[PDB]
Structure 1
Amino acid sequence: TFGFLYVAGYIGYVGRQYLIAVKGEAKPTDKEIIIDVPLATKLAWQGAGWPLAAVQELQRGTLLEKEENITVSPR
């Protein structure tokens, strides 16, 4: 169970980082339909220390967003 948790957190984290990195560019739809190979490789190799990176982000309170999400009429 510990091995699986590690590898799954790895996959999820590198996915999140790719999404974020490609989100701040001039064609998100294009980067989502076609992949930047160098970007993919860089983010893959840097996905290693993902538990440390994530706990640091938590300690900075950055991984969670403030109350600015799209929201249905009642709440």
Structure 2
Amino acid sequence: EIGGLTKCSESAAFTKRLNASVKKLEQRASQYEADSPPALALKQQVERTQARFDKYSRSELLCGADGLPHLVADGRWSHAAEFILPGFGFIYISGWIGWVGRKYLRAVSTSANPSESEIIINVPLALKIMTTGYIWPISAWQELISNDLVAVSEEITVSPR
């Protein structure tokens, strides 16, 4: 397919890996009695291994010659579940964290003792501000348009050139 790869549900090496992993787990399980907690734990590991291999098989994941899933991250939507959608989630979460941190720092910058509020967090203000993170991109846009996001150079210290 892409890059001369093949679907893991069509890869002989992938299925060989599944069989090998299950066989080693069951060989370990064969040393105990059927009702021993080691045996039950090993058989649950076997089930989880089989479920994982099956989940990768039913997915769109592609596989190289080694029989391991490879990720496609050139921007195609047909593989968006591998980089694009997780990337969307990460950007959303990280922007939330950063926006609420910046907002809290700017809010306590005008308190009686700004430095004290950085080592001893005002928890009520922090929780209130953290709950506002979900609209961080809209807030960021409004801050950018209203000239509150970006400062002027004349107001920022620099060293002699």
TM-score by length of 2: 0.44
Q: Measure how far apart 1:16 and its partner are.
A: 0.2
1:36 aligns with 2:137: no
The alignment partner of 1:64 has SS state of: coil
1:51 aligns with 2:127: no
17-26 vs 60-69, greater mean Cα deviation: 60-69
5+ residue gaps, structure 2, are 1-86
One-letter identity of the residue aligned with 1:73: P
Q: 2:96 aligns with which of 2, 5, 10?
A: 10
Q: 2:113 aligns with which of 14, 27, 44?
A: 27
How many pairs align?
A: 74
Q: Deviations over 1:19-68 (max 9, x none)?
A: 00011111111111101111011101112211100011112232000111
TM-score by length of 1: 0.91
Runs (4+) of structure 1 exceeding 4 A deviation are none
33-42 vs 58-67, greater mean Cα deviation: 58-67
Q: Distance in 1 between matches of 2:111 and 2:142?
A: 26
State the identity %. Answer: 46
5+ residue gaps, structure 1, are none
1:64 aligns with 2:159: no
Q: Relative contact order (alpha carbons < 8 A, sep ≥ 6): 1 or 2 greater?
A: 1
